Design a protein around this ligand. Structure first.
Ligand SMILES: CCCCCCCCCCCCCCCCCC(=O)OC[C@H](COP(=O)([O-])OCC(O)COP(=O)([O-])OC[C@@H](COC(=O)CCCCCCCCCCCCCCCCC)OC(=O)CCCCCCCCCCCCCCCCC)OC(=O)CCCCCCCCCCCCCCCCC
Ligand SMILES: CCCCCCCCCCCCCCCCCC(=O)OC[C@H](COP(=O)([O-])OCC(O)COP(=O)([O-])OC[C@@H](COC(=O)CCCCCCCCCCCCCCCCC)OC(=O)CCCCCCCCCCCCCCCCC)OC(=O)CCCCCCCCCCCCCCCCC
Ligand SMILES: CCCCCCCCCCCCCCCCCC(=O)OC[C@H](COP(=O)([O-])OCC(O)COP(=O)([O-])OC[C@@H](COC(=O)CCCCCCCCCCCCCCCCC)OC(=O)CCCCCCCCCCCCCCCCC)OC(=O)CCCCCCCCCCCCCCCCC
Ligand SMILES: CCCCCCCCCCCCCCCCC[C@@H](O)O[C@H](CO[C@H](O)CCCCCCCCCCCCCCC)COP(=O)(O)OCC[N+](C)(C)C
Ligand SMILES: CCCCCCCCCCCCCCCCC[C@@H](O)O[C@H](CO[C@H](O)CCCCCCCCCCCCCCC)COP(=O)(O)OCC[N+](C)(C)C
Ligand SMILES: CCCCCCCCCCCCCCCCC[C@@H](O)O[C@H](CO[C@H](O)CCCCCCCCCCCCCCC)COP(=O)(O)OCC[N+](C)(C)C
Ligand SMILES: CCCCCCCC/C=C\CCCCCCCC(=O)OC[C@H](COP(=O)(O)OCCN)OC(=O)CCCCCCC/C=C\CCCCCCCC
Ligand SMILES: CCCCCCCC/C=C\CCCCCCCC(=O)OC[C@H](COP(=O)(O)OCCN)OC(=O)CCCCCCC/C=C\CCCCCCCC
Ligand SMILES: CCCCCCCC/C=C\CCCCCCCC(=O)O[C@H](COC(=O)CCCCCCC/C=C/CCCCCCCC)COP(=O)(O)OCCN
Lengths: 56, 121, 329, 53, 64, 54, 459, 104, 175
């Protein structure tokens, strides 16, 4: 019965929320290390006609 | 280092007027979040010591602890950033004004540097 | 295409089906020993064909089917050598195992754990087939240790008897003394020849030094129960008579002689190791026959007979006659 | 997880190295080059220090 | 219980430093270490001398 | 098992450390609480600082 | 890397907000889920590393250790479920909190781009283990065991902090990447010798190196089952990981510096293997076997060759799994007999056949039976040592023979013979214990199918 | 359930404590004999005969038939050395020295 | 099979004798291989053809990754970290490729030894001598680097080897 099993089963959602938050934080921290994107001498590439960034 | 005797420094200013030229810390700064976590822990310990339901005894008191910790942490972060900015500024100024003590090292390539090789046997 | 490889791999593969079915319903019924005996007989009649092809032509093949791992310049893969020795020994071993299992269906009739006993015999046979057909040193070591563990488990079959456990631990101790030399040989071959594969070892060793051959001789003496490391074989009679008939009589104990046979191209280029092999075989056969001459237990007498025959086999190895030693095996 | 580990893509680049080695050995055998070279770097680009002892 | 306690925990409180204990401890705890150190040091010095002199014939020695 | 592990290895680091620290603790903390001796030591200490550090 | 760290942190509020009768189920389920997430890290490259951010990186040396650390927690919870039945809910939650904090510290330790962060977490792991040992311990010697465990580690690791701050003051960085790329040789000097000693001794004392291994038997015997599991499986490998990370700056000083430690380890494996032959306690025997294995790992790391490093990594993983399984089996016997003495309960194969099968498989894996990864590491290290010197083969063979001897001695003494007559409280083995042994043993035989996953960065 | 006074102690030096130790280990005073008071930590523990367990009577009704021991009896310091699975000291028909000479 | 290059993995023409029965007795090998063909090779071929047509119904491609050449360690500054990183990655890739070249040569040697049978000591001199050259080169380039190997240490080893060679040549010429 909803609104009753939630009071006992609300705890289960916490570990999963932590995982998605950690993935988001990993991507957010990744966003700050783009100083050499498409500037490495090995993977120096010309952009596609509809490409702004080689990787995200 | 010792910046106590630094010239043009006011005796009891927490944040000088020249500190306002630096970007302020964001409200979502991880250090501010850690200060809020410290305030939450203080509230939980206060609940536990007084023999009260730890999680849900006083919501107003826990909110006050978190808010006070966040406020003081924000101002402390501002002062810390200003002090580190001063350190870097003085460093760069001194390096600029004393060229003879910091010469440009003649750049050298590894193909013409002889390094001893120690075999692993 | 070339049914030689398909049949030779099929025999070894079908030898393992009852092990997979050991968790099925047939393992809990009294038809399991007959099932395993039928499987062994079918494997024997199947393996009779590659021997026939070799007899007609002389077919020789190497099968490197699965690549397990590669460390730098060294590549390790599951490789099977299907030469004269393998295609001649497999039918004989399968025939003997089939006969011994049919005998055990009668001998071990009142033993509550007969399905387990039969399963163990199958496990030992599988390990011995792994040992015989191995093409590199790591696989042959796998079989080398598997047969030893099966010997330990089958000797101490009646685990309530102190002497059976003592004999099993004795066999383990002597086999580990041999394993020391085995590991020494493996290390030497990997360090110098840069391979555990037999082909590369045969190419890069025209004048094989003393150390790897001495390690191989130590391993062979340990597993074939030569004079230095002999006493474990007579003590291995604590196990059931079918175990003493299969493992410690005709199939397991010839493993050291077979190992020396497998490395015969390097053995003939060394004269001191051949001399040591000859002396060891002679002293072993004499001492074991002299022990046998006055024993009262029949199983002990026949075990000492087996040890003396192994000594004669290693004498034949010492006089540079490996194929004759294989025929005697 | 075992199935996932079994089917992990080759980020260690083993078959890539196999293909590179295959093409290099094809090129060198055909052109008469002696396979692998003893020096990893071309001696023209190393400036050794003159001893004058 | 007495057997296990005497074998494990009653040893040190009854220990007394004596010439016998001192000499046996020194021997059994120091002698093997220096013996093996001497053996391995001599072997490795010999091998290094042979390598420097170039007469060791390390052909096909790729993995170490 | 016994001679090395349970006796001599135990004697070398841990038992020796414990014995030395306990003896030093006993020596340091065994003071009768008389200001006579304390200020006599202070006088001795003051004299040493004047004559040994300059 | 935060996709693993954040769920581990969220394990704490979930545990503390759980129902009084649902802590174990939730903790086990979410720990298993966290472990599944950790599996993604195994994919590794032949190039530099998996540099997630400035703070954390992953490598094929750190990935298997992280996977083992994440996998161990559900097993520890399963083992601890039994003896904590009569405990209050708050104290059980505190125990689970200690385990979670230890996992978090280990996870952050194994990534650790910067060396002072590595030291801080490597020392932070010391507190939860100490609390577990000295709080939930059965005997009265747990206090002395905890004191030994604390003070050996701290005495070893205090000079390491001074060495690290000196290295950063001189070089300018402690980030492992810069340290590796800007490495410079160490001149044979007394100051460099003492810097080498300060860098090495902290990891040596936790291996444990022979002669500095006294704390380990006490700590392992007096700890609860979960503490013994974690100490034998993960906490011993911290020293090996640290040595592998730090020996990059100790060259060429290591060539002659290593001799005292090489001799100590080579003789101490024989010494501890022989000690295992005369032991009246299961836990002490398992602990001394761990000491022998870690001494051989020390030899591998000191030899400092690619085969040495691969063998050391494989042996670390295999030993962790095997020692955890052996400790769990010993605990299953102890919870029935309450004695912890080998000779009391005998002939248990007649009463518990499946547990006897588990005993046999664990003993065979400890015996290094091929093609188990235990023998893979053993053989790689033996070959590397033989290339180092052909005379090591004698000691290696002696160690192998004695190892087989005491492994089968431990199996035969407890499983074979005649049952003790007066012991009549030996109940059938529960499904929990059988599942614990199965989850210990199946990963080993699955990993032997893909040995490249545990062979380290030099594969 | 075992008390503090029931554990092994230090080497006995007086006849009274010798008798007390003999009573503790459930044997006669005339049959009690500790190890020599050397540096090694035997302390107060009877020095039983070095006879093996294999040569004990196989027809007595031992409480432990496999180990051939009786409940409450003093245990030899090296019991795990003589467990019928290891070194035994059973007399042989031929003397040790003659056997050594013949074998050598 | 086109799945591998025949030039990288050379094989002799594999000349085989022809059946020359000297007696009227029918040998069992031919009958057994015929029944083996009928009962094994035909269903296997049918299943393979079915699977191959199912694969041809859905065809897609994958490509070999090409890597550009970058400056090596010999032309990097003392404390320049970016070029050092690029050169180290390139050197590691070259090390892997060299290892696989040695693997190819070893496979050739093993195949020759197995194929030539009893006359391998004479008929496989070419593979043995190629392996001798490749092993000598590989040994010179990477031996004794240790666990913590890098391009800088390999360059130092090459530098000392060239210094020794130059000194020996000067001493021999000026002898
Ligand atoms: C690494 C950093 C990351 C993690 C940080 C780690 C620390 C975190 C927490 C820090 C402290 C803050 C909270 C502690 C307050 C103390 C209260 C307490 O005891 O607990 C009782 C209380 C439950 O009991 P109760 O029913 O209320 O009444 C019982 C009485 O309180 C009293 O019951 P009793 O008196 O009947 O029981 C007696 C018992 C009770 O005595 C205690 O338990 C005292 C508490 C421990 C001392 C705390 C020290 C201060 C912080 C130190 C942290 C050290 C970390 C460093 C690592 C080393 C580890 C030592 O004491 C004993 O049994 C004696 C033996 C002691 C055993 C050994 C001692 C070891 C203590 C070390 C603990 C260190 C970690 C603490 C973790 C949290 C523990 C609650 O616990 C709680 O419920 C509060 C826990 C936190 C609540 C979380 C809720 C938030 C979740 C919802 C939102 C989701 C968040 C995410 C957002 C996004 C999602 C959408
Ligand atoms: C780490 C991995 C593995 C490591 C293994 C661990 C092994 C390490 C531990 C080794 C420990 C051995 C040395 C222990 C210290 C000996 C003294 C002692 O323990 O005091 C108790 C004890 C003091 O008690 P006490 O009340 O003065 O007299 C009690 C005796 O019953 C009364 O005796 P007495 O009055 O008849 O004595 C007369 C005579 C003893 O006459 C003799 O027959 C022995 C002379 C040979 O003494 C001498 O003449 C001294 C020479 O000393 C002795 O009784 C025996 C002292 C003579 C033992 C000689 C020392 C052995 C040589 C070892 C040196 C080798 C390396 C040293 C390194 C140093 C540079 C770093
Ligand atoms: C050889 C090929 C086999 C193919 C068949 C597939 C078999 C699948 C087995 C999966 C792994 C076993 C799991 C361990 C716990 C067993 C569970 C259990 O309780 O059984 C109850 C179940 C029901 O019996 P129950 O009456 O209800 O229970 C009463 C008692 O339990 C009384 O029960 P018990 O008296 O019957 O004893 C239990 C049994 C089962 O317990 C065990 O000890 C089995 C585990 C032995 C391994 C010990 C570690 C050594 C390192 C090996 C690592 C390689 C693993 C390969 C990958 C594995 C993938 C998971 O122990 C033994 O029978 C003695 C084992 C000694 C064998 C020594 C030879 C090992 C080396 C051979 C080389 C292997 C690779 C070949 C490479 C070259 C050729 C390609 O009985 C069974 O099903 C027995 C399991 C089958 C026997 C396995 C023997 C060899 C298989 C090893 C792994 C597969 C190799 C892959 C190659 C295939 C080609
Ligand atoms: C345990 C951690 C420390 C806690 C400290 C107590 C927290 C409550 C205190 C509340 C704030 C007090 C600040 C007072 C308000 C104005 C201060 C201002 O007027 O004075 C300035 C001084 O500012 C204060 O010094 C800054 C105080 C901030 C303390 C935080 C640092 C703690 C170390 C890092 C641990 C993190 C703690 C975060 C949680 C609290 C100017 O000083 P100045 O006249 O020019 O020279 C005197 C000092 N000299 C001689 C050394 C140069
Ligand atoms: C019980 C009675 C018998 C019943 C069962 C009968 C059936 C027998 C089958 C059992 C074993 C027989 C051997 C058959 C092996 C075939 C499978 C093998 O080929 O797959 C392996 C693959 O196995 C996996 O790689 C290894 C398993 C993963 C191990 C991870 C453990 C799981 C996580 C648990 C926690 C971790 C704890 C330890 C920390 C490290 C190797 O494959 P590989 O040649 O390479 O390449 C795969 C294919 N490619 C080419 C497309 C890529
Ligand atoms: C207790 C359980 C085990 C714990 C761990 C033990 C491991 C620690 C051992 C430390 C390793 C060796 C330390 C120094 C090795 C350097 C080599 C040196 O000792 O040998 C000779 C040194 O000669 C003499 O040994 C001088 C030192 C004498 C004083 C040292 C005390 C000797 C015994 C002390 C052992 C105590 C260890 C435990 C401390 C509590 C070489 O002569 P020399 O060419 O000139 O010096 C070369 C070095 N240079 C180039 C920097 C100058
Ligand atoms: C079963 C019923 C289903 C029948 C349908 C399948 C019919 C066969 C088709 C299989 C597809 C082919 C295939 O298996 O792929 C190859 C694949 C190998 O993977 P690769 O990537 O190609 O190379 C290995 C290194 N990466 O082959 C297989 O895995 C199948 C057969 C493997 C060999 C058998 C292994 C048995 C022993 C287990 C390992 C034992 C431990 C290791 C011993 C080391 C010895 C040196
Ligand atoms: C090197 C070997 C070093 C010696 C190892 C000592 C191991 C001690 C621990 C073993 C545990 C105790 C034990 O096993 O008990 C002894 C046990 C029981 O006695 P039983 O005769 O079976 O009587 C039972 C019926 N009543 O017997 C044994 O198994 C002991 C075996 C010890 C063998 C030692 C001799 C080995 C010497 C080898 C020399 C020859 C070298 C090889 C020559 C090769 C030439 C190429
Ligand atoms: C399980 C217990 C083990 C405890 C650890 C044992 C070894 C401890 C390591 C030695 C302690 C000091 C570490 C040095 C810190 C690193 C700093 C450094 O290396 O710089 C050296 C500093 O070197 C020193 O000063 C060392 C002095 C030693 C004083 C402390 C002695 C402690 C005990 C030493 C003997 C025992 C060491 C081995 C113990 C064996 C295991 C018990 C050079 O200094 P500079 O003056 O700046 O440069 C010289 C050019 N001008």
């Amino acid at each position: 019965n909803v609104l009753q099993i939630v009071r006992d089963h609300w705890v289960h959602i916490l570990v999963p929320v932590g995982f998605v938050f950690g993935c988001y934080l990993d991507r957010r921290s990744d966003e700050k290390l783009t100083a050499f994107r498409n500037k490495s001498l090995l993977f120096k590439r010309e952009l596609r006609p509809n490409e702004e960034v080689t990787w995200k | 280092t010792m910046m106590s005797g630094r010239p043009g420094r006011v005796p009891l200013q927490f944040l000088p007027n020249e500190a306002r030229s630096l970007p302020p810390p964001k409200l979502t700064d991880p250090r501010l979040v850690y200060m809020g976590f410290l305030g939450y822990c203080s509230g939980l310990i206060d609940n536990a010591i007084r023999r009260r339901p730890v999680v849900s005894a006083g919501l107003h008191r826990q909110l006050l602890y978190v808010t006070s910790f966040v406020f003081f942490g924000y101002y402390l972060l501002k002062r810390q950033d200003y002090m580190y900015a001063l350190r870097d500024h003085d460093m760069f100024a001194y390096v600029k004004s004393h060229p003879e003590d910091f010469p440009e090292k003649d750049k050298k390539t590894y193909g013409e540097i002889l390094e001893e090789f120690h075999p692993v046997r | 295409m070339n049914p030689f490889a398909s049949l030779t791999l099929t025999t070894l593969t079908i030898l393992t089906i009852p092990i997979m079915m050991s968790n099925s319903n047939i393992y809990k019924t009294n038809l399991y020993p007959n099932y395993v005996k039928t499987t062994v007989s079918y494997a024997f009649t199947l393996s009779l064909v590659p021997l026939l092809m070799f007899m007609h032509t002389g077919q020789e093949m190497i099968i490197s089917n699965w690549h397990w791992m590669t460390l730098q310049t060294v590549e390790l893969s599951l490789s099977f050598k299907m030469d004269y020795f393998s295609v001649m020994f497999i039918p004989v071993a399968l025939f003997v195992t089939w006969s011994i299992m049919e005998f055990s269906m009668w001998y071990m009739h009142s033993d509550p754990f007969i399905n387990r006993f039969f399963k163990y015999l199958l496990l030992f046979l599988i390990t011995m087939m792994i040992l015989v057909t191995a093409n590199n040193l790591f696989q042959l070591f796998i079989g080398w240790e598997g047969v030893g563990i099966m010997s330990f488990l089958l000797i101490g079959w009646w685990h309530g008897r102190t002497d059976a456990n003592t004999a099993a631990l004795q066999a383990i101790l002597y086999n580990r003394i041999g394993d020391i030399g085995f590991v020494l040989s493996m290390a030497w071959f990997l360090t110098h020849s840069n391979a555990w594969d037999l082909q590369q070892i045969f190419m890069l060793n025209n004048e094989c030094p003393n150390m790897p051959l001495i390690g191989l001789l130590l391993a062979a003496a340990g597993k074939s129960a030569q004079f230095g490391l002999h006493p474990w074989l007579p003590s291995a009679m604590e196990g059931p008579t079918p175990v003493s008939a299969l493992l410690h009589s005709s199939t397991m104990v010839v493993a050291g002689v077979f190992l020396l046979i497998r490395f015969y191209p390097l053995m003939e280029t060394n004269k001191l190791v051949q001399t040591m092999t000859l002396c060891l075989g002679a002293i072993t056969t004499l001492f074991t026959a002299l022990c046998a001459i006055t024993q009262n237990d029949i199983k002990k007498i026949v075990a000492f007979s087996t040890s003396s025959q192994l000594g004669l086999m290693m004498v034949t190895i010492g006089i540079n006659q490996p194929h004759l030693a294989f025929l005697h095996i | 997880g075992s199935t996932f580990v079994a089917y992990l893509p080759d980020y260690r680049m083993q078959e890539w190295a196999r293909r590179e080695a295959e093409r290099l050995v094809k090129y060198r055998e055909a052109n008469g080059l002696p396979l692998m070279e003893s020096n990893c770097f071309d001696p023209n680009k190393i400036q050794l220090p003159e001893d004058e002892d | 219980i007495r057997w296990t306690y005497a074998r494990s925990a009653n040893i040190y409180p009854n220990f007394r430093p004596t010439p016998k204990t001192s000499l046996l401890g020194a021997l059994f705890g120091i002698g093997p270490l220096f013996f093996w150190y001497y053996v391995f040091k001599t072997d490795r010095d010999k091998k290094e001398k042979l390598i420097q002199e170039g007469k060791l014939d390390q052909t096909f020695n790729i993995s170490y | 098992s016994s001679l090395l592990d349970l006796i001599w290895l135990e004697t070398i680091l841990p038992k020796t450390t414990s014995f030395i620290q306990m003896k030093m603790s006993i020596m340091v903390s065994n003071q009768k609480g008389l200001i006579k001796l304390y200020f006599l030591s202070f006088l001795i200490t003051i004299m040493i600082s004047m004559t040994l550090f300059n | 890397m935060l996709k693993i760290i954040i769920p581990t942190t969220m394990l704490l509020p979930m545990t503390w907000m759980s129902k009084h009768n649902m802590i174990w189920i939730n903790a086990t389920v979410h720990s298993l889920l966290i472990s599944l997430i950790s599996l993604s890290l195994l994919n590794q490259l032949g190039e530099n590393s998996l540099n997630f951010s400035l703070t954390f990186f992953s490598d094929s040396l750190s990935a298997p250790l992280l996977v083992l650390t994440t996998w161990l927690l559900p097993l520890m919870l399963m083992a601890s479920q039994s003896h904590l039945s009569k405990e209050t809910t708050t104290r059980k939650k505190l125990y689970i909190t200690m385990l979670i904090l230890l996992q978090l510290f280990l996870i952050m330790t194994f990534t650790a781009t910067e060396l002072i962060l590595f030291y801080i977490l490597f020392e932070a792991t010391l507190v939860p283990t100490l609390i577990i040992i000295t709080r939930w311990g059965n005997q009265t010697e747990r206090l002395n065991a905890g004191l030994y465990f604390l003070f050996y580690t701290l005495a070893g690791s205090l000079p390491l902090l001074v060495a690290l701050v000196y290295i950063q003051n001189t070089t300018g960085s402690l980030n492992f990447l810069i340290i590796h790329y800007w490495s410079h040789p160490l001149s044979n000097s007394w100051s460099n010798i003492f810097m080498w000693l300060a860098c090495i001794m902290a990891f040596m004392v936790k291996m444990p190196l022979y002669g500095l291994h006294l704390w380990l038997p006490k700590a392992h015997v007096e700890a609860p089952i979960a503490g013994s599991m974690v100490l034998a499986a993960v906490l011993l490998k911290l020293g090996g990981y640290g040595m592998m990370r730090i020996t990059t700056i100790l060259n060429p000083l290591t060539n002659y510096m290593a001799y005292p430690f090489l001799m100590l380890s080579m003789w101490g494996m024989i010494m501890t293997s022989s000690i295992c032959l005369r032991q009246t306690d299961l836990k002490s025997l398992i602990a001394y076997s761990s000491v022998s294995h870690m001494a051989l790992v020390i030899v591998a790391i000191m030899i400092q060759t690619p085969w040495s490093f691969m063998g050391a990594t494989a042996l670390m993983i295999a030993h962790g799994l095997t020692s955890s399984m052996l400790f769990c089996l010993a605990n299953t016997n102890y919870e029935r007999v309450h004695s912890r003495t080998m000779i009391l309960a005998r002939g248990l194969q007649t009463l518990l056949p499946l547990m006897a099968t588990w005993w046999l498989v664990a003993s065979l894996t400890n015996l290094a039976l091929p093609p188990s990864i235990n023998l893979i590491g053993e053989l790689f290290i033996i070959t590397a040592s033989f290339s180092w010197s052909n005379i090591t083969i004698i000691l290696m063979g002696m160690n192998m023979m004695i190892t087989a001897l005491y492994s089968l001695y431990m199996l035969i003494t407890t499983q074979r013979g005649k049952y003790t007559h007066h012991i009549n409280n030996i109940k059938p083995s529960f499904t929990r214990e059988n599942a614990l042994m199965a989850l210990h043993i199946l990963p080993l035989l699955l990993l032997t199918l893909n040995p490249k996953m545990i062979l380290g960065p030099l594969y | 359930h075992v008390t503090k006074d029931m554990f092994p102690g230090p080497y006995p030096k007086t006849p009274e404590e010798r008798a007390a130790a003999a009573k503790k280990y459930n044997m006669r005073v005339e049959d009690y004999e500790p190890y020599p008071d050397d540096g090694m930590g035997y302390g107060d523990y009877p020095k039983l005969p070095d006879r093996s367990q294999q040569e004990r009577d196989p027809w007595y009704d031992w409480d432990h038939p496999d180990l051939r021991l009786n409940w409450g009896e003093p245990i030899h310091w090296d019991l795990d050395m003589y467990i019928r699975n290891r070194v035994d000291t059973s007399p042989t028909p031929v003397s040790w020295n003659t056997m050594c000479k013949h074998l050598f | 099979p086109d799945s591998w290059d025949k030039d990288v993995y050379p094989e002799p023409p594999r000349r085989t004798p022809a059946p020359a029965p000297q007696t009227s007795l029918p040998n069992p090998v031919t009958y057994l291989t015929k029944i083996f063909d009928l009962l094994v090779d035909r269903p296997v071929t049918l299943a393979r053809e079915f699977i191959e047509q199912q694969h041809a119904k859905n065809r897609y491609y994958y490509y070999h990754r090409e890597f550009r050449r970058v400056p090596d360690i010999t032309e990097c500054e003392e404390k320049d970290i970016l070029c050092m990183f690029e050169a180290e990655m390139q050197w590691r890739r070259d090390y892997k490729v060299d290892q696989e070249i040695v693997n190819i040569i070893q496979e050739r040697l093993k195949a020759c030894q197995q194929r030539e049978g009893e006359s391998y000591r004479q008929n496989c001199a070419k593979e043995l001598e190629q392996f001798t050259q490749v092993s000598k080169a590989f040994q010179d380039r990477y031996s004794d680097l240790g666990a913590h190997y890098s391009a800088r240490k390999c360059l130092a080893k090459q530098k000392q080897r060239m210094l020794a060679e130059r000194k020996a040549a000067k001493e021999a010429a000026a002898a």
